[PDB]
Structure 1
Amino acid sequence: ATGDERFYAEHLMPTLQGLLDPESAHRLAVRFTSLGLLPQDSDMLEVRVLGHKFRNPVGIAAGFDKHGEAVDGLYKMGFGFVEIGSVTPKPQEGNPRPRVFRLPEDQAVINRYGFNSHGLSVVEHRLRARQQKQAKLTEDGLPLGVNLGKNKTSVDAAEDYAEGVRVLGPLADYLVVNVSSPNTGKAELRRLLTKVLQERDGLRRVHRPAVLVKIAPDLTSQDKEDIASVVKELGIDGLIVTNTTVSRPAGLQGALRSETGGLSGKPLRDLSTQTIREMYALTQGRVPIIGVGGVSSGQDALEKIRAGASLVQLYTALTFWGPPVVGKVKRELEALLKEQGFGGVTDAIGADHRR
């Protein structure tokens, strides 16, 4: 471990988080990153998936940069790809404060932001302003994803996601649609994803993004079977596994454990990993998976890759370790690939299923 990794984890992050409320910490992080106020990837880390080169498999998950304000800084931090959003059609404020809660004893966060968004038009103009720079970044193995949401008052989710495809699809390497429990159904999911794909296929080939579906871990076995079936039937390009959990695993110690919202970080890790394992098996290893939930080490990343993830993302680990976590995960992942006899990340994808 480096000097910076230890300093940030043991001293700087605990001090800054002790002085700030959690939402102020988030806003300041976005501002610092956007300005590049921050501290070489080996070829073993390169992955080719989703019609693109990824110079490393470690991405920033949706939620950190909801409004596309810090994309270039996130690449400077060392992420192999960036996902912005969720972005809603119209601007909206989200839920009343307080809406973000730290559980330091669990290395977890709970949030109920409620899709606070600057809206598609603002994000469109922000991305347009750097679109050629992004085209070069993407060519150099640093792709951009855009996560689409829906407005609170919308009657038809398909219309909101269609609007997002039309407006931000031409500026993205991939798009993400979040899907909730269809049975608490399948025909409605099929309808939704059919419209998204028809809208996507309407874009000029040079600006035609991949489409991924992001799922929560709070799905029945029937929900997961139904999602896998629809994804294969329609030719959805990939899955993001997983969002935050509305469950509260036994053993949480944080005083704020009973706050409403989505739980992220370490308590989500193995729930996420098990969901990757299930979705990889249900899609016969033919649908790329981005693995997300509780990643803070090379071991955590490798467990998701071996379970079936082609790429991984993190967010919550940044809140505890700061920017040095990105280099930590990458260095540890490279070391573990070498220790286990893999030629690169590619050879490890789904390796637990071929035992």
Structure 2
Amino acid sequence: LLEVVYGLLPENFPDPELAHDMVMWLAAKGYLPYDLERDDPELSVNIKGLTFHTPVGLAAGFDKNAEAPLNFCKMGFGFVEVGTITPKPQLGNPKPRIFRLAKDHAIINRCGFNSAGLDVVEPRLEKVSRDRWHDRLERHCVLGVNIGKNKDTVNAEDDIREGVKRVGRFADYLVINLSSPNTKGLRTLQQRDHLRSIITAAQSELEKLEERSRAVTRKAEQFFPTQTGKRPLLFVKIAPDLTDEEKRDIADVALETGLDGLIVTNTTIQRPESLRSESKHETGGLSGRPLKAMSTKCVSDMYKMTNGQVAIIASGGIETGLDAYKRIRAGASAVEVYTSMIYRGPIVARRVKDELLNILNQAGIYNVQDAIGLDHRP
């Protein structure tokens, strides 16, 4: 806990964008820490057939163009959610477009879907997908592929379509990002009427299943190779800033469509007075410790309103396996981190896994599967 939070004397900051860049340069070229503990068999979760050997995982903010997803994942994580990968490459907003709020343990940011392109990112999944089995054959590093629209396409439904065409076959779970505050009216695609039109279109390009056998796990890599027969569990990442009315419209359209899961909360555009740090007034959604009750309620509301029959991967201020314990108790099968690592640091994957496992030991039940949603047994 006390690494960077104790040692934050140096002025405003060492720039977050710059830091993340030279961090990911390290991530790209090995040059990182390493988890060794193998993770207790307690912490494994079979979210709809998907074996999450650990339920802790890196969120979609980090490895934005598949620079090093397995290397973050060998560094203690269970899964790694890969960017928001827009069809055509985007530059993003003008920098400085991202800020630490040291006091508040938070990060406001307005990057705006800065992507390399499915042109660039497909090859890198073509890379990862075939060598991920090879390198050290990990109890496969479960792999999230998150996709969106470009700044100004008329039909996002097309850019999700393209997305699912290209980079679907590698994802253990695919993710439609409809939530970022930092793309023009994208969040307003979460509507009952649109959400459906997208979700159906998106599982319609999954309905492109192609044929084979017609001219150790050495070679599971062949075919469309997602630790199984391809089909990613379809997800949609939803907002934190929503009416009970709009969380119905979602939850209804979730159970209507047979959506395989929901990722609970992107960043929040709320600014709760309590934020003391003088960067509180910058635009963009804020992550981290202010997004605690926000996210954790959003898990619980979407759990119950989906009868729990839809899966939940909650992000939003998951700092310590206690926060993970509660979000697991509120509905989450697995949980995500990003802004919690910018204060904890690389070996926070190993920390949150074990903080969770001991608070399971203390709570009584071990093996999380029993644990999920526990809050909805009265």
For residue 191 of structure 1, report the CA deviation from its aligned partner: 1.1
Kindly indicate whether residue 66 of structure 2 is the aligned counterpart of residue 43 of structure 1: no
The answer to whether the 8 A contact 2:189-2:195 is kept is no
The answer to whether the 8 A contact 2:3-2:343 is kept is no
CA distance in 2, matches of 1:27, 1:202: 36
CA distance in 2, matches of 1:183, 1:126: 29
CA distance in 2, matches of 1:17, 1:115: 29
Report SS of the residue matched to 1:101.
strand
| Distance change (3 Å), C-alpha of 1:52 and 1:133 | farther
- Code of the residue aligned with 1:56 in structure 2: it is T
Report SS of the residue matched to 1:202.
coil
CA distance in 2, matches of 1:247, 1:18: 23
Q: How does 1:311-326 map to 2 (within 5 A)?
A: 311-326=334-349
The answer to whether the 8 A contact 1:33-1:70 is kept is yes
Counterpart of 2:217 in structure 1 is none
For residue 15 of structure 1, report the CA deviation from its aligned partner: 7.3
CA distance in 2, matches of 1:153, 1:106: 34
For residue 8 of structure 1, report the CA deviation from its aligned partner: 5.7
For residue 306 of structure 1, report the CA deviation from its aligned partner: 0.3
Counterpart of 2:18 in structure 1 is 24
- Code of the residue aligned with 1:43 in structure 2: it is P
Report SS of the residue matched to 1:198.
helix
RMSD of equivalent CA atoms: 2.0
CA distance in 1, matches of 2:190, 2:233: 28
The answer to whether the 8 A contact 2:147-2:175 is kept is yes
Kindly indicate whether residue 260 of structure 2 is the aligned counterpart of residue 237 of structure 1: yes
For residue 105 of structure 1, report the CA deviation from its aligned partner: 0.6
The answer to whether the 8 A contact 2:178-2:190 is kept is no
Report SS of the residue matched to 1:130.
helix
For residue 333 of structure 1, report the CA deviation from its aligned partner: 0.4
| Distance change (3 Å), C-alpha of 1:56 and 1:185 | closer
| Distance change (3 Å), C-alpha of 1:259 and 1:191 | same
**1:194-246 per-position Cα deviation (integer Å, ceiling 9, x unaligned):** 11111112133732211101001011111100101111111110000010001
- Code of the residue aligned with 1:132 in structure 2: it is R
Shifted more, 26-35 versus 277-286: the winner is 26-35
TM-score (normalised: structure 1): 0.93
For residue 20 of structure 1, report the CA deviation from its aligned partner: 2.5
For residue 307 of structure 1, report the CA deviation from its aligned partner: 0.4
| Distance change (3 Å), C-alpha of 1:97 and 1:7 | closer
The answer to whether the 8 A contact 2:101-2:279 is kept is yes
Counterpart of 1:69 in structure 2 is 67
The answer to whether the 8 A contact 2:57-2:335 is kept is yes
Kindly indicate whether residue 192 of structure 2 is the aligned counterpart of residue 186 of structure 1: yes
Give the number of aligned pairs. Answer: 349
Kindly indicate whether residue 185 of structure 2 is the aligned counterpart of residue 156 of structure 1: no
Q: How does 1:118-133 map to 2 (within 5 A)?
A: 118-133=116-131
CA distance in 1, matches of 2:162, 2:49: 23
For residue 121 of structure 1, report the CA deviation from its aligned partner: 1.2
Q: 2:201 aligns with which of 178, 187, 195?
A: 195
| Distance change (3 Å), C-alpha of 1:218 and 1:211 | same
CA distance in 2, matches of 1:70, 1:166: 22
Report SS of the residue matched to 1:48.
strand
The answer to whether the 8 A contact 1:61-1:83 is kept is yes
For residue 142 of structure 1, report the CA deviation from its aligned partner: 2.0
Counterpart of 2:320 in structure 1 is 297
Shifted more, 31-40 versus 273-282: the winner is 31-40
Kindly indicate whether residue 205 of structure 2 is the aligned counterpart of residue 211 of structure 1: no
CA distance in 2, matches of 1:184, 1:44: 35
The answer to whether the 8 A contact 2:144-2:173 is kept is yes
Kindly indicate whether residue 137 of structure 2 is the aligned counterpart of residue 114 of structure 1: no
CA distance in 1, matches of 2:132, 2:104: 37
Report SS of the residue matched to 2:348.
helix
Unaligned runs of 5+ in 2: 180-186, 211-223
The answer to whether the 8 A contact 1:8-1:324 is kept is no
| Distance change (3 Å), C-alpha of 1:272 and 1:257 | same
For residue 256 of structure 1, report the CA deviation from its aligned partner: 0.7
**1:265-321 per-position Cα deviation (integer Å, ceiling 9, x unaligned):** 000011000000000000001111001100110111101000000000000011111
The answer to whether the 8 A contact 1:94-1:116 is kept is yes
- Code of the residue aligned with 1:172 in structure 2: it is A
**1:86-106 per-position Cα deviation (integer Å, ceiling 9, x unaligned):** 000000101111100111010
CA distance in 2, matches of 1:166, 1:215: 22
Q: 2:27 aligns with which of 18, 24, 33?
A: 33
TM-score (normalised: structure 2): 0.88
- Code of the residue aligned with 2:144 in structure 1: it is G
The answer to whether the 8 A contact 1:85-1:147 is kept is yes
Counterpart of 2:307 in structure 1 is 284
